[PDB]
Assembly symmetry: D2
Homo-oligomer: 134 residues x 4
C-alpha cells in the first residue's frame, strides 16, 4: 500500500541516523512493516570486536519480535552508499526467512530510487525451520 510504502521508506532513512558504526563509518537503517500496519525500525550497531556487531535489518526484526510481532509484510533498507542499492547480507536474509519467504525487501539508494525483491528471491532454495521439523 502506497501510504505504507512511503512511511516505511522514510522510517528506514531516519533510522540510519541512530547507527553506531564508528568502525566502518557505514551507517545502515532499516524499517519493517507488520501485518497490522505497525512499523519497527533499526540500525547497525558495531562492536570493537567486529563479529559482535549487528545489522540494521536484524535490529528492526528483533525489536518487532520482542514486542510480540512476527507477521511481516515488508522491510526497507537504507544506507549512504550512492552507487548501489543497499542489499541485505546473507545473515539478515536468513533471519528474514525465519519469519516467511513471501514478503518484500525494498533495497534503496540515498536518492530515493529502489528495487524490490521477495525474501524467497533473495534466498533461493533456503535452509529454514523445515530442516529441523519432525
Amino acid at each position: 500500500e502506497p501510504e505504507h510504502v512511503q512511511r516505511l521508506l522514510l522510517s528506514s532513512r531516519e533510522a540510519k541516523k541512530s547507527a553506531y558504526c564508528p568502525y566502518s563509518r557505514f551507517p545502515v537503517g532499516a524499517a519493517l512493516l507488520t501485518g497490522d500496519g505497525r512499523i519497527f525500525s533499526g540500525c547497525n550497531i558495531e562492536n570493537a570486536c567486529y563479529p559482535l556487531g549487528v545489522c540494521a535489518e536484524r535490529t528492526a526484526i528483533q525489536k518487532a519480535i520482542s514486542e510480540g510481532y512476527k507477521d511481516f509484510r515488508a522491510i526497507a533498507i537504507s544506507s549512504d552508499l550512492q552507487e548501489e542499492f543497499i542489499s541485505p547480507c546473507g545473515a539478515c536474509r536468513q533471519v528474514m526467512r525465519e519469519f516467511g519467504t513471501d514478503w518484500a525487501v525494498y533495497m534503496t539508494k540515498p536518492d530515493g530510487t529502489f528495487v524490490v525483491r521477495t525474501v524467497q528471491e533473495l534466498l533461493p532454495a533456503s535452509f529454514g525451520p523445515e530442516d529441523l521439523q519432525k
Copy 2:
C-alpha cells in the same frame, strides 16, 4: 541503583521473557536495561533454525536502546526459567555490554527474585575493547 528501579528492571525482564522466540532450545530468556535518564528497554532471545543466527535477550535489549538513541546504561537485569541457577550473560553479551562501558551493573536473577549483581568489568576482566583499535 534504587530498589525501585531494580524492581522495575526485574518485572520488565520477566515480562519480556514472555515474548521469547525460542522453539529450538525451549529456553526463554528476558532482559531489561536501565538508561542514565531512567528509561527501560527490554528484550528476549530470538532464535533461528540456523542456531548461530539467534540473538540473546541482553543484546536484543541493548540494540533496541541504541536504535532509539540511548547509549548511557546504568544496569541490566536478566531472567530465565532456570530455578536452580542465576542466569548469567554469555561472553558475547558481556562483550556487547562492554562496548558501552565497564562500570555498570548486571543483575543475574532466579525466578524467585533473588539475584547476584556484578559489574561488566567483573564479568569481563582484562577485556578486549574499543581501545585495542585506537
Copy 3:
C-alpha cells in the same frame, strides 16, 4: 560422477562424523575444494549459547583461509536429512561470497544425490566488498 565430485561427496560425508552438535543433534559436514585440488573439511560446532555456534561450511572455509588458501572451486554440504538436500544458511552464503561468486555449492542427500548452484545464484544482488568500496 567426475572424480572431484566423488571426492567432494565422500569428504563432506566423512566430515559430518566430527560434528559437535549436542544441542540440535543436527550434524553437518562440508568439504571445500581449492583451485589446486586440496580439500578442506569442516563440521558444525555448537555452543551452549546457541548464537556462538559455527556452521560446517564456515569451519571448512575458515580452515582453508587460515592455511593460506583463498581460491575456491566448490563446496559440498552433507546432513542426516534423507529427504531434503542440505542447503547453506544465509550466513554461510555471505562468507562464501567474500571469496567469490563464481564457484559451486553441492547440496546433497545421504544417498549421494545432489543439486548444484553457484554462490551468485544462492546470494543474488549480494552485499559484499563493493559496499565498503574495497574493490579498487
Copy 4:
C-alpha cells in the same frame, strides 16, 4: 620459557601472517595446544559484513574440533598491538568455555611478553552447557 610455551608463542605469531583483515587492518593470530601436544593455528577472517567475521581464537578451536580434538591445554593470542597484551573477546571466551574452564590463555605482546589467565578467570560465573542440561 618452557618448550611448549615457546611453541605456542611462535605459532601464534606465525598464524597472524595468514589473517584476512582488510577492513580492520588489525591482524590476530592464535595457537591452540592440545593435551597430546598438537598445535592448531588460527587467524581472524573478516567479512564485508562486519558481524560475519571470525576471530583467531575461534578459527583455531574450530579447526581442532573439526579434526576430533577437544582436550585443550592452552591457547596463545598474538596481535600487532605493542601497547597492550591482546586479550580474547567475550565471544571467544565463551567458545573456549564450552570445552572447559581450567585451561590457560596466553595474552601476548609482539615483544614476546605475556600474561596468563585461565578461561575461568577470564569468564567468571559463566553461562555454559550446564544451563541447558535436561535434568536439574
